[PDB]
Amino acid sequence: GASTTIEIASDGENLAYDKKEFTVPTGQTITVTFKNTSTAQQHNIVIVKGGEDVAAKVDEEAINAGPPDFLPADRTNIIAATKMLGPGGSETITFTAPAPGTYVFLCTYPAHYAGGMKGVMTVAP
Numbered sequence: 001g002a003s004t005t006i007e008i009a010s011d012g013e014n015l016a017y018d019k020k021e022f023t024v025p026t027g028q029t030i031t032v033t034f035k036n037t038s039t040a041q042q043h044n045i046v047i048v049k050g051g052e053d054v055a056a057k058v059d060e061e062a063i064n065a066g067p068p069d070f071l072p073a074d075r076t077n078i079i080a081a082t083k084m085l086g087p088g089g090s091e092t093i094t095f096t097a098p099a100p101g102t103y104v105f106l107c108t109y110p111a112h113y114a115g116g117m118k119g120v121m122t123v124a125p
């Protein structure tokens with residue numbers, strides 16, 4: 001199940017990814033390519049350091065941070081994040097997988113996380 005190279009995309013015009021979960025091996029370099037395949041939406045992907053409580057706080061810092069990237073000033077709670085992609089844009093991010101555990105991924109464009117645009121990165125031991 002575990003993989004070091006992940007391809008993920010938005011689903012149509014909905015506030016959802018085409019993957020709700022993926023697994024990565026701990027301690028190794030991971031490549032994640034996100035494609036905003038929508039025709040009219042803004043999307044990113046943010047992998048946070050922990051679960052739903054961390055994700056909620058990053059989402060709130062994001063909407064306060066505002067346009068155009070909607071990300072917090074620093075990455076203390078972020079494993080990796082793309083920039084805010086327009087329709088048809090894509091980005092590839094790179095990070096050492098952290099300690100084994102479950103890590104929420106989410107889009108921080110306003111209302112999209114609450115709208116269900118989220119998933120879980122499981123990090124295998």
Ligand SMILES: [Cl-]
Pocket residue numbers: 002003004005
């Ligand atoms: Cl692999």
Ligand SMILES: [Cl-]
Pocket residue numbers: 044045069070071081082083084085
């Ligand atoms: Cl972003």
Ligand SMILES: [Cu+2]
Pocket residue numbers: 015042043044107108109112117
């Ligand atoms: Cu989004």
